[PDB]
Design a protein around this ligand. Sequence first.
Ligand SMILES: C[C@]12CC[C@@H]3c4ccc(O)cc4CC[C@H]3[C@@H]1CC[C@@H]2O
Ligand SMILES: C[C@]12CC[C@@H]3c4ccc(O)cc4CC[C@H]3[C@@H]1CC[C@@H]2O
Lengths: 247, 247
Amino acid sequence: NSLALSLTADQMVSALLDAEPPILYSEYDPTRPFSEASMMGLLTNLADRELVHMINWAKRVPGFVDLTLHDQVHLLECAWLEILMIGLVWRSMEHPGKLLFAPNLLLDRNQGKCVEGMVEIFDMLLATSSRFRMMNLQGEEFVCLKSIILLNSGVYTFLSSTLKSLEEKDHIHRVLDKITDTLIHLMAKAGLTLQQQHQRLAQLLLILSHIRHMSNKGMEHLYSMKCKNVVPLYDLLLEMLDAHRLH
Amino acid sequence: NSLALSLTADQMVSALLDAEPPILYSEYDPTRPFSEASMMGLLTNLADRELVHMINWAKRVPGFVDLTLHDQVHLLECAWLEILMIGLVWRSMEHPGKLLFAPNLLLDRNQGKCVEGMVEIFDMLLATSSRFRMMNLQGEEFVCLKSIILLNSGVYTFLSSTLKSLEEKDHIHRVLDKITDTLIHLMAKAGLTLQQQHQRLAQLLLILSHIRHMSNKGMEHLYSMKCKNVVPLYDLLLEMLDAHRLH
Ligand SMILES: C[C@]12CC[C@@H]3c4ccc(O)cc4CC[C@H]3[C@@H]1CC[C@@H]2O
Ligand SMILES: C[C@]12CC[C@@H]3c4ccc(O)cc4CC[C@H]3[C@@H]1CC[C@@H]2O
């Protein structure tokens, strides 16, 4: 029972709002064509650099510092790729058929093909990117999901199975609900019926499964581009990919 | 605008209830020890046989026959492994630390180790299996999720991108919401507050992401056991695994 558990909806929101990270750029080189390695670079490079903030952003979430330190690393490394992606989709909200990676690196399904196996995912992000537009997502709702991912993705599969374990699991859940009261609130504050409020909470959350899915698939891709000596040796990024210990 | 879109909550439910498939058994052979192939068999074998029903169950869902035929195959083959798993978890609800695969094949984390890479997942299902218990899930709620998976998992990533496409996407969504009105209803009918009704809808859905996740991981496992000439050549199962076209 700490901070988070008290904050009024708006409070919750502003916090979440003010806690956001900066929109990076990319030393994008439009001078030369992207190869199944050139872009990969730009991409993995952006990722790596974004992750530094994402970690700081992390601590800024409510109730997140209240978890054990290892657990946070656990949550943080279980949901990152999703966080990168939910960010991307939002970023690319406005410009359909395009993925505003960075205000400088704006790609379309085409460059997607430059890199292998890359295409699919891109479209997966694209569609999600649309489903958001078609829903008229809202910066407030976004930040809610963003954090929700951080808290869900990985909660069930923690690092423990003891008493402090069933406590943490219980905190994360308590925070989560608070986040819901908030979400459901930003909708009353928009004039939705009760029914609409339900239905929208669903609509949103459900997407998250698709994200979970994209995140899963993307990760497989990345691990394959690494087993191809194409991915720059990025300390941080490698660390997050390794946490998944996938094959 | 067909059937589904009308059915009263209960109507929706009973339908969903009556539409359920039978709980299979397994020609389980407790006579001899399971090897990283013996069990695999039992498992993949159960899977294959369950899938026959799951397909029939499918048609029994509302609004599902209203989709194009290819799309249904699409949805059905995009969410199956999840459907098997959400089934399993429910089945194993009552007996913690155990996974009631079939009323005859009841395993624990141990046998899980018999097969390789198998352990992890098992625990993932276990925890989910618990999270359900700790929530006192309800047969009514279950069938709702079950179908919800069928409808979500794969909707965004359909087979088209034309007009009839944006229609189907629009139907599936309309059905989904109806399912939500139902869920939210089975909770009023249980005496939950408004707040509780929100919070629970979340709690449930959110899990679905974990399922999405487990389903993703499991699939990778299965495809690896196949690349190990350990998996029996099961027509149906192979077909579903192939739809994912994973690497
Ligand atoms: C990890 C990948 C490279 C980095 C990409 C990125 C990089 C930065 C960012 O903010 C979002 C994303 C989303 C998709 C990611 C890709 C999915 C497949 C690819 O390997
Ligand atoms: C597909 C696997 C074998 C079949 C298993 C099954 C088989 C039948 C069923 O009703 C549920 C499940 C859930 C987990 C599945 C497993 C996940 C990994 C393994 O390869």
